[PDB]
Amino acid sequence: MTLPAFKAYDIRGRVPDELNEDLARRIGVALAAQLDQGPVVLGHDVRLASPALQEALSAGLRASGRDVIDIGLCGTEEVYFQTDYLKAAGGVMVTASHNPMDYNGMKLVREQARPISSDTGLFAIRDTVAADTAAPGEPTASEQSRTDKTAYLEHLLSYVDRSTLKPLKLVVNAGNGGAGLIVDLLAPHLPFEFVRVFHEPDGNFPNGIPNPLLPENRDATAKAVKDNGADFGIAWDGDFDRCFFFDHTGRFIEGYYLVGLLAQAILAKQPGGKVVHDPRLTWNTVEQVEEAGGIPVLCKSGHAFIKEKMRSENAVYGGEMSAHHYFREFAYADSGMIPWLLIAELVSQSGRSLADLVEARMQKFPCSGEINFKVADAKASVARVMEHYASLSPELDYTDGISADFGQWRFNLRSSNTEPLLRLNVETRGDAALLETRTQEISNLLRG
Ligand SMILES: O=P(O)(O)OC[C@H]1O[C@H](O)[C@H](O)[C@@H](O)[C@@H]1O
Numbered sequence: 384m385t386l387p388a389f390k391a392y393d394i395r396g397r398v399p400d401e402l403n404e405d406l407a408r409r410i411g412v413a414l415a416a417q418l419d420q421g422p423v424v425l426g427h428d429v430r431l432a433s434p435a436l437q438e439a440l441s442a443g444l445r446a447s448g449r450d451v452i453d454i455g456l457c458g459t460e461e462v463y464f465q466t467d468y469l470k471a472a473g474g475v476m477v478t479a480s481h482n483p484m485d486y487n488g489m490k491l492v493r494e495q496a497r498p499i500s501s502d503t504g505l506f507a508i509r510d511t512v513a514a515d516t517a518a519p520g521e522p523t524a525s526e527q528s529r530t531d532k533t534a535y536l537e538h539l540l541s542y543v544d545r546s547t548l549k550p551l552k553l554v555v556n557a558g559n560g561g562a563g564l565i566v567d568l569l570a571p572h573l574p575f576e577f578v579r580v581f582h583e584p585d586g587n588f589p590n591g592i593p594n595p596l597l598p599e600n601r602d603a604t605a606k607a608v609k610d611n612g613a614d615f616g617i618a619w620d621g622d623f624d625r626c627f628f629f630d631h632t633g634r635f636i637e638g639y640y641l642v643g644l645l646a647q648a649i650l651a652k653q654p655g656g657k658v659v660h661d662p663r664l665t666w667n668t669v670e671q672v673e674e675a676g677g678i679p680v681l682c683k684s685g686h687a688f689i690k691e692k693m694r695s696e697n698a699v700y701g702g703e704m705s706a707h708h709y710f711r712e713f714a715y716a717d718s719g720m721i722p723w724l725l726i727a728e729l730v731s732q733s734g735r736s737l738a739d740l741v742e743a744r745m746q747k748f749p750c751s752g753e754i755n756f757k758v759a760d761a762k763a764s765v766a767r768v769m770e771h772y773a774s775l776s777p778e779l780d781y782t783d784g785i786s787a788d789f790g791q792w793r794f795n796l797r798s799s800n801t802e803p804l805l806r807l808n809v810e811t812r813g814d815a816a817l818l819e820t821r822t823q824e825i826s827n828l829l830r831g
């Protein structure tokens with residue numbers, strides 16, 4: 384067989400049978416052979432076992448003659464940022480995301496924080512690690528601790544005109560992940576009043592593994608917003624590359640609508656720019672991008688495809704409905720910090736609430752939200768859906784699974800690249816009834 388921890392986009396598995404210090408050291412050795420010249424940036428999340436896995440990576444990298452830049456406890460975007468900013472050969476973030484307590488993982492990048500994925504180095508690393516029975520060498524290169532976040536913080540603040548910001552009251556919910564550290568470093572430079580929920584980093588996760596999409600976790604932010612009269616709330620996943628927004632009513636804003644909102648915010652600063660979006664939900668983004676004078680660029684989902692499309696297009700911004708937002712100036716990488724700074728600036732400058740910034744868009748392009756299906760036979764299930772709708776002659780697009788545009792409604796149906804699931808998204812042209820009947824119709828076909 385093959386090592387199960389090696390997935391399409393990253394390394395993820397149970398400790399210690401799928402991932403451990405020995406495997407981590409071998410990954411460091413193997414990564415050294417895959418990179419162009421330079422040092423390697425290493426960072427880690429709040430999970431209890433993450434430092435030891437990072438130390439093992441460092442030992443393997445240094446035995447292979449790579450200098451290591453240890454940026455310490457951080458978010459995933461800090462590994463991206465420092466890898467690019469320091470002109471390093473690559474970087475590794477040790478992060479378990481929202482996998483169980485006995486799980487960990489790694490996200491690996493090369494120069495300019497370009498992703499290393501299954502077909503771009505990750506399976507090559509896997510195959511080297513799998514066959515590597517050599518005795519561990521000793522270090523022939525040094526590790527330096529670089530915990531200065533000044534350049535990173537300055538970069539984040541560069542996205543907004545601080546003199547235009549108003550003293551909004553913002554709920555922030557790190558979920559006991561790492562986001563609060565950055566919020567607190569930014570706060571002296573911002574006028575906002577922060578209401579801090581689940582703020583302290585704690586890899587024991589007394590309030591649940593960080594996952595703002597789970598209703599119990601969602602409700603903690605919503606309650607804080609409502610009880611404190613906050614202008615809006617922001618929650619993050621544990622490594623804070625995903626951000627989640629709650630309006631002043633406590634309502635969670637579906638991530639689809641943040642793509643168009645952020646695109647308009649960015650296009651104000653960079654007129655005429657291209658914006659990359661995924662094929663899951665599209666109509667609102669295309670319209671908002673065009674209305675703001677930008678050019679929308681359809682791309683397959685998944686951060687590696689998005690980033691390379693952005694690079695080839697000089698796109699200023701890209702966004703997925705799955706709470707991933709990519710910024711050209713940020714090494715084409717995703718940040719969970721840039722988006723809420725931009726939204727806070729937009730609320731400050733416009734005088735409009737976050738709710739009102741999205742309300743009409745949500746009415747105009749209502750969507751199902753992503754609905755996941757584990758079925759016995761995904762291919763047969765997709766075929767049943769397509770056969771059922773064939774007589775309507777939808778416009779079909781195969782950029783990522785199947786997108787079918789029927790005129791007043793459309794859907795995207797695709798296999799996930801991170802879980803063995805089918806993912807469905809439906810949207811309509813201002814028609815909530817059609818959305819529900821078509822969503823239920825497709826759901827019945829998929830489960831048939
Ligand atoms: O919908 P999936 O194929 O499961 O991918 C869902 C998400 O997985 C990871 O988080 C990637 O970084 C994202 O770019 C991707 O959108």
Ligand SMILES: [Ca+2]
Binds near residue numbers: 459480622624625
């Ligand atoms: Ca994350």
